[PDB]
Design a binder for this molecule. Structure first.
Ligand code: HEM
Ligand code: HEM
Ligand code: HEM
Ligand SMILES: COC1=C(OC)C(=O)C(C/C=C(/C)CCC=C(C)C)=C(C)C1=O
Ligand SMILES: COC1=C(OC)C(=O)C(C/C=C(\C)CCC=C(C)C)=C(C)C1=O
Lengths: 378, 241, 49, 75, 70, 61, 96
């Protein structure tokens, strides 16, 4: 016997990163899983060092954030790595979900459903993150968001006031958000392990969607180094952002301290929620807007039930590819609209794009699968 | 009112990806802050010691702090006296409560300067175009004689008077204090107060690009070398009969 | 690279608005009679005269 | 789970391989390489490109209508 | 003020303000300017034509300005 | 002085993982310095705005 | 805090009204005086800790809000202190 194979602790490592039979043909798109892994740790590490100087009190919140960038040695990179890493975490998250959708990976129900929980969790996590500096966008973002929950009939007012710790986004609300933003990423990690636990029952899918038992390779030279090369590419993207354009994806207004009387004309989320934001305001209703806001994310849990094709991947399905790319293109439209005022053009296009999003996933994509089956005489 | 105009693209000496600040220009801009702006603008986040590594020297920075009075801590009686000025203090001065700014300038606050460049939309360009580009009210739009005119302002009803040609200055070696010139410097300095890490970051960023340009191909070649075995593998199927 | 990021995170736990050390307190000797130990605050530390 | 030796049944397949220290990491890299990327591009443009231009167009038009709308002649 | 300090802004602005794109925009400025003067109960107030003129001028301003500034 | 070159590097230093490590650590030390100064000077040339001005103000201390 | 405990809404309001607080700033950036709510606390004596010293002489009457729990012996230490004052025995002079 070996040492790697038999030791209780090393076994786990061996079975997950060394001797794990992996398909020989997975491409970049499969890298986002390890990249999310890196982003999770990067968020935790820079997140901890910030917590060593950050104050959770409205009196000194902004000041402590400023204290970090001017006074704390190298406090600024840590702060921007954190901020930009959160965006890197969403770019990877979106690649990952999309990869799963195109390739049929969702057929691993538990893995995928756990993945949905992971998406929601980092979303809930990042939202609370952004409130912490107590900028104008932090406060008004915190306000606009939480208040959505007041549309829930009979329970909504009490619910919003319960999470607020008052009648507004005040002292109680900031400290609160700190605590939850600290504990959430650890829980995320425990869930990322369960995610990887379910994934291991089958091993990875691959571009063709066809089983690869016939040609597996060890994760041990091939995917360790391909993940390495890929993390280096994540570092480039992140560092390019932080050492050259640290505010590019940021809102210059979150730089003005919170003012509960000053409502900026602006008022929009961080870019990663813009598509959902666009879907929300497309509806001339308080309940429906938030009902459809929720449904724009929870729909990923309906996807496996709407698989209709006899093939797993999209590699061999042209009609489906077009529909997929129209989903991604529709999601650009949604974010773009979400980052725009609710005035002319913008209302009706963002209204129709919302319908398209749901017409696409719920009706068009399945119908295409049936048609494709038929063309193949299946 | 609901109509607006966007600032041009001025060739700041710190616009390029790997471009430092003109530290001589941050000085004069600090000078502009010191007399003019300071009387109304709070720069709560910058201190005297912050200038040391940047523009001035230990000695000079001490002296500039000594030209004001702070209100130091209490002693035996529970007091509140005055002190020359250290290096340790910051620049919080104008007036206490935000309401005092309003009482003075009239229901308007000259928003704190320490974070301005980074808080506008358009950086130094918004501010430069504002300060330099003051003009005269066209037809039918009357103001409120405290609401001056600036095209580069939301709604165009601004509460700030144009204070850039009031030619003050101590351009030590010799630099003319034209409206243009005082404005470049004041914005160049403002860039710095909003983003003090600016230069050092671009030095790291330079190094990040050189390291990556060395590391990227190398890790790629390491990975290709190991994937070799698979890329040139040849298969053959040899069934019975 | 590893050095640099590690060094930077390590360094983030030292200086700040903690370069102070001004003090240089001038103490009036006639305020402390014979046999008494008078303590003052000097550079964030107790100073006995 | 998984392991190697318990995956699936395979018969009559030979696999010739060569050591990484005896071959080049980048064989015809530009020679065979670039043609392949062009070919991969051809294969996919008609499926990836169109959705996106439809947005590109909707974006530029959408912006023009909006900005042109906040202006006015008579009445 | 009265006479003595040579604003590079004013200098380069002349040459700039002049030029084609701005000649035309200022034409509409004046056109619309004189309309609003010629009435009473009106509200089409010329705010727009001013900004368009300024834009065209100011783009050319930036391009040619800072060169001389020391 | 070319085929025998990478051959010597392998013979004298890369064969054992001992030397291999010792060489990259000895190699990390010198490289750090050469890259740092070498890159500072490139950052130095494309600029000339920071502490080149120092010669003036100081000295008078 | 007294409402649920001893007094009533009305009575508690009144006791707060028998002092003046120094409320927030208005338009001019002021600092005026107000009757007393129910919302305020009991911070009053004097500002800086040094003022206690200047007065009582280099000594501070330690804050009362946490005394019982901060002594060793609870109310007993304080009760025995307050009630059990006595006279200095032989050879131990004080400082008046
Ligand atoms: C903290 C967030 C996440 C982490 C750390 C995580 C980590 C990983 C890792 C390491 C892999 C294996 C390598 C790979 O294919 O990338 C993977 C695959 C997968 N993940 Fe995630 N992921 C996360 C979020 C998601 C999300 C948002 C979903 C979609 C709801 C998702 C569903 C999947 C699925 C279905 C696979 C299998 C893909 C395949 O084999 O083709 N996970 N994940
Ligand atoms: C438990 C590990 C984490 C800790 C201890 C942590 C702690 C902090 C602290 C103290 C702040 C306020 C300082 C600042 O604004 O820079 C902050 C801001 C933020 N964090 Fe985290 N966080 C952690 C993980 C995360 C995760 C998982 C995300 C989601 C990607 C995240 C995204 C954010 C965002 C978006 C902000 C506000 C934007 C900004 O940087 O100004 N962080 N965090
Ligand atoms: C050259 C030095 C100064 C600079 C660079 C400066 C810069 C600025 C900037 C960038 C703004 C905000 C622009 C915006 O909100 O979008 C502002 C607002 C204002 N400043 Fe100044 N300022 C200076 C000197 C003064 C002085 C001397 C006064 C006193 C007359 C003054 C009174 C105001 C007021 C009242 C406002 C508020 C306008 C409003 O929002 O209604 N500032 N200034
Ligand atoms: C004020 O600016 C805003 C944000 O920034 C603070 C957001 O983040 C979001 C969207 C946020 C979430 C969590 C939607 C997901 C809801 C469920 C039930 C999954 C919106 C709409 C927004 O307006
Ligand atoms: C064969 O398919 C797989 C890969 O190739 C695409 C991977 O790259 C990874 C990488 C996963 C890592 C390094 C774990 C990170 C998780 C945490 C909680 C830090 C896994 C699991 C995998 O199954």
């Amino acid at each position: 016997t070996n040492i790697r194979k038999s030791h209780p602790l090393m076994k786990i490592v061996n079975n997950a990163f060394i001797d794990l039979p992996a398909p020989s043909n997975i491409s970049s798109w499969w890298n986002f899983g390890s990249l999310l892994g890196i982003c999770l740790i990067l968020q935790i590490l820079t997140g901890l060092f910030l917590a060593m100087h950050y104050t959770s009190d409205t009196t000194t919140a902004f000041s402590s954030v400023t204290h970090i960038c001017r006074d704390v040695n190298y406090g600024w990179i840590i702060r921007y790595m954190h901020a930009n890493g959160a965006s890197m975490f969403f770019i990877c998250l979106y690649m990952h979900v999309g990869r799963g959708l195109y390739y049929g990976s969702y057929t691993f129900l538990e893995t995928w459903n756990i993945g949905v929980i992971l998406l929601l969790t980092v979303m809930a996590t990042a939202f609370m993150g952004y409130v912490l500096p107590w900028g104008q966008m932090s406060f008004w973002g915190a306000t606009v968001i939480t208040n959505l929950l007041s549309a829930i009939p009979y329970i909504g007012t009490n619910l919003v006031e319960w999470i607020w710790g008052g009648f507004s986004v005040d002292k109680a609300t900031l400290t609160r958000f700190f605590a939850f933003h600290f504990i959430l990423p650890f829980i995320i990690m425990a869930i990322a392990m369960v995610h990887l636990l379910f994934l291991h029952e089958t091993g990875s899918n691959n571009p063709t969607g066809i089983s690869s038992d016939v040609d597996k390779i060890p994760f041990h030279p091939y995917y360790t180094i391909k993940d390495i090369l890929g993390a280096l590419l994540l570092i480039l993207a992140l560092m390019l952002l932080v050492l050259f354009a640290p505010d590019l994806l940021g809102d210059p207004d979150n730089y003005t301290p919170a003012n509960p009387l000053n409502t900026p004309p602006h008022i929009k989320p961080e870019w990663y929620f813009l598509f959902a934001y666009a879907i929300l305001r497309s509806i001339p209703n308080k309940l429906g807007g938030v009902l459809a806001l929720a449904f724009s994310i929870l729909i990923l849990a309906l996807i496996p039930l709407l698989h209709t094709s006899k093939q797993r991947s999209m590699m061999f399905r042209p009609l489906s590819q077009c529909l997929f790319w129209a989903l991604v293109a529709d999601l650009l439209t949604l974010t773009w609209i979400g980052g725009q005022p609710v005035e002319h053009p913008y209302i009706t296009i963002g209204q129709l794009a919302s319908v398209l999003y749901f017409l696409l996933i719920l009706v068009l994509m399945p119908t295409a699968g049936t048609i494709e089956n038929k063309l193949l005489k299946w | 009112s609901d109509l607006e105009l966007h600032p041009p693209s001025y060739p700041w000496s710190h616009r390029g990806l790997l471009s430092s600040l003109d530290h001589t220009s941050i000085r004069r801009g600090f000078q502009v802050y010191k007399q003019v702006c300071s009387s109304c603008h709070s720069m709560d986040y910058v201190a005297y010691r912050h200038l040391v590594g940047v523009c001035y020297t230990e000695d000079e920075a001490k002296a500039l702090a000594e030209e004001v009075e702070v209100q130091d801590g209490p002693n035996e009686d529970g007091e509140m006296f005055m002190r020359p000025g250290k290096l340790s203090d910051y620049f919080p001065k104008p007036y206490p409560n935000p309401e005092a700014a309003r009482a003075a300038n009239n229901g308007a606050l000259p928003p704190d300067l320490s974070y301005i460049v980074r808080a506008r939309h358009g950086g130094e360009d918004y501010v430069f175009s504002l300060l330099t580009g003051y003009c005269e009210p066209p037809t039918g739009v009357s103001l409120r004689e405290g609401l001056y005119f600036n095209p580069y302002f939301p709604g165009q009803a601004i509460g700030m008077a144009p204070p850039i040609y009031n030619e003050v200055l101590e351009f030590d070696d010799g630099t003319p204090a034209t409206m243009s010139q005082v404005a470049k410097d004041v914005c160049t300095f403002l860039r710095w107060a909003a983003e003090p890490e600016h230069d050092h970051r671009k030095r790291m960023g330079l190094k990040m690009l050189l390291m990556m340009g060395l590391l990227l191909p190398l890790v790629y070649a390491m990975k290709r070398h190991k994937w070799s075995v698979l890329k040139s593998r040849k298969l053959a199927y040899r069934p019975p009969k | 690279a590893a050095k640099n990021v590690v060094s930077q995170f390590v360094s983030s736990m030292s200086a700040s608005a903690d370069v102070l050390a001004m003090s240089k307190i001038e103490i009036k000797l006639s305020d402390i009679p014979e046999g008494k130990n008078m303590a003052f605050k000097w550079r964030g530390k107790p100073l006995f005269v | 789970g998984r392991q190697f030796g318990h995956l699936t049944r395979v018969r009559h397949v030979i696999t010739y391989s060569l050591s990484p220290f005896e071959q080049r990491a980048f064989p015809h890299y530009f020679s065979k390489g670039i043609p392949n990327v062009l070919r991969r591009t051809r294969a996919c443009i008609l499926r990836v490109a169109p959705p996106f231009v439809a947005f590109y167009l909707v974006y530029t038009w959408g912006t023009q209508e909006f900005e042109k709308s906040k202006r006015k002649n008579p009445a | 003020e009265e006479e003595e300090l040579v604003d590079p802004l004013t200098t380069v602005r002349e040459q700039c303000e002049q030029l084609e794109k701005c000649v035309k925009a200022r034409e509409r400025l004046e056109l619309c300017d004189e309309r609003v003067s010629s009435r009473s109960q009106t509200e089409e107030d010329c705010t727009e034509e001013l900004l368009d003129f300024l834009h065209a001028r100011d783009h050319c301003v930036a391009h040619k300005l800072f060169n001389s500034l020391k | 002085v070319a085929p025998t070159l990478t051959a010597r590097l392998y013979s004298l230093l890369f064969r054992r993982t001992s030397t291999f490590a010792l060489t990259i650590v000895v190699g990390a030390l010198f490289f750090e310095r050469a890259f740092d100064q070498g890159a500072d000077a490139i950052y130095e040339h494309i600029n000339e705005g920071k502490l080149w001005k120092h010669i003036k103000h100081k000295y008078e201390n």
